[PDB]
Design a binder for this molecule. Structure first.
Ligand SMILES: *[C@@H]1O[C@H](CO)[C@@H](O)[C@H](O)[C@H]1NC(C)=O
Lengths: 215, 211
């Protein structure tokens, strides 16, 4: 197979600046004066969409800030100047020989000014506690950059091993993220304690923010 | 308007078989070369099968040759993928894709995908719990389901502003969980009704939960 390797695997670019994504093929995709490398954009929940075909041709309907170059085994996608809506994963794909093959994708993150999370805490519902399990949820809403520290405290004691986090894809309009942290306890354990607290450290916060409730 | 709509995906035991369908509309289907392309949980895209607009000529990668059969019914505008001796590594979202007319050298249209899961694990429907509430936040916890995916809307699709549905997380149990949240004016809490609508097609689960 013609194995395609993309670099970098992820890239962060400031608004208005240039994104450059590379794709290297293990054998040449040139045939009779053209180079059969395509580029697709993919956003979450959608199929990929072709932006560039045969190395350097824009598909109809694509903005002018996208362009493709290269030949043989070496190809580049350029985006300049990047906009918020360009946050996405980009894939190269060769069509010179069967089997058609895809690169592994490059995720493009659009850099923006720091934005602090709005923090919310949710106790477990009565319904769930009936099942013998308590899930306590902490929400960090519409922040940038993605790096954030979320610590759970129970009667002021630090928790470890009993939470999981999930993060949204970057927003196509305002380049922020949101994050959930779920703390999972047994009912018995949950009822042993009074104060449940989520403490959030983030670059946008003048100091750590704690949201809490009493059971 | 060109449209491709995949159907037929589901949960299958290893070694099992399943047939996917793609309904095509808005173009002369018989004139086009068509492929199936899949996307693994790791987000890797893999071309799976191709059928030309001539001779019923079919092509496959060695990973599925002998196990997968692509076919077409031009009179019914339908593309098919029959899969047999299924393996865990076949788990993926399966897309129907149209080749650009003439040179056929790129995919110019795709469907929305249908999900195939190859696993010995049982189907499990989700439990839906409320996350009860300047701005207020509220939501729904969709917990302990298999397999992916689940769909979540609010007030039947009328409420989309401020909605974040988080990517599912795999728990150590092998079951998935996710939350969906929405922010609203804390004054609207008294008057407005908020319902999360959860669909888990593999288990035939449709739930509406008032928060
Ligand atoms: C491939 O292209 C990029 C720029 O287009 C360049 O940095 C790199 O040196 C090229 N590789 C080779 C082997 O020419």
């Amino acid at each position: 197979d013609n194995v395609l390797t993309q670099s970098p695997a992820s890239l962060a670019v400031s608004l208005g600046q240039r994104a450059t994504i590379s794709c290297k093929a293990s054998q040449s995709v040139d045939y009779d004066g053209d180079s059969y490398m395509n580029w697709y954009q993919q956003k979450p929940g959608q199929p990929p969409k072709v932006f560039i075909y045969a190395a350097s041709n824009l598909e109809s309907g694509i903005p002018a800030r996208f362009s493709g170059s290269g030949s043989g085994t070496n190809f580049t996608l350029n985006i300049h100047p990047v906009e918020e809506e360009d946050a996405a994963t980009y894939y190269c794909q060769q069509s010179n020989e069967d089997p058609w093959t895809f690169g592994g994708g490059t995720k493009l993150e659009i850099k923006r000014t720091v934005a602090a999370p709005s923090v919310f805490i949710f106790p477990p519902s009565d319904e769930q506690l009936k099942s013998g399990t308590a899930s306590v949820v902490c929400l960090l809403n519409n922040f940038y950059p993605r790096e954030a520290k979320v610590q759970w405290k129970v009667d002021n004691a630090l928790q470890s091993g009993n939470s999981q986090e999930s993060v949204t894809e970057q927003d196509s309009k305002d380049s922020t993220y949101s994050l959930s942290s779920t703390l999972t306890l047994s009912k018995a354990d949950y009822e042993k304690h009074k104060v449940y607290a989520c403490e959030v450290t983030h670059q946008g916060l003048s100091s750590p923010v704690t949201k809490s409730f009493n059971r | 308007e060109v449209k491709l709509v995949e159907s037929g995906g589901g949960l299958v035991q290893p070694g099992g078989s399943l047939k996917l369908s793609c309904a095509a509309s808005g173009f002369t289907f018989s004139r086009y070369t068509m492929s199936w392309v899949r996307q693994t949980p790791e987000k890797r895209l893999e071309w799976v099968a191709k059928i030309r607009n001539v001779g019923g000529i079919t092509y496959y990668p060695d990973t599925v040759k002998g196990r997968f059969t692509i076919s077409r019914d031009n009179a019914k505008n339908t593309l098919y993928l029959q899969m047999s001796s299924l393996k865990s590594e076949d788990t993926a979202m399966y897309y129907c894709a149209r080749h650009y007319y003439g040179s056929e050298d790129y995919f110019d249209y795709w469907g929305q995908g249908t999900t195939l899961t190859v696993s010995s694990a049982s189907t499990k429907g989700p439990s839906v719990f409320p996350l009860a509430p300047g701005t207020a936040a509220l939501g729904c916890l969709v917990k302990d389901y298999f397999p992916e995916p689940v769909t979540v809307s609010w007030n039947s699709g009328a409420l989309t502003s401020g909605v974040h549905t988080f990517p599912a997380v795999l728990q150590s149990s092998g079951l998935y969980s996710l939350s969906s949240v929405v922010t609203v004016p804390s004054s609207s809490l008294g008057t407005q009704t908020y319902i999360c609508n959860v669909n888990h097609k593999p288990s035939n689960t449709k739930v509406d939960k008032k928060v």
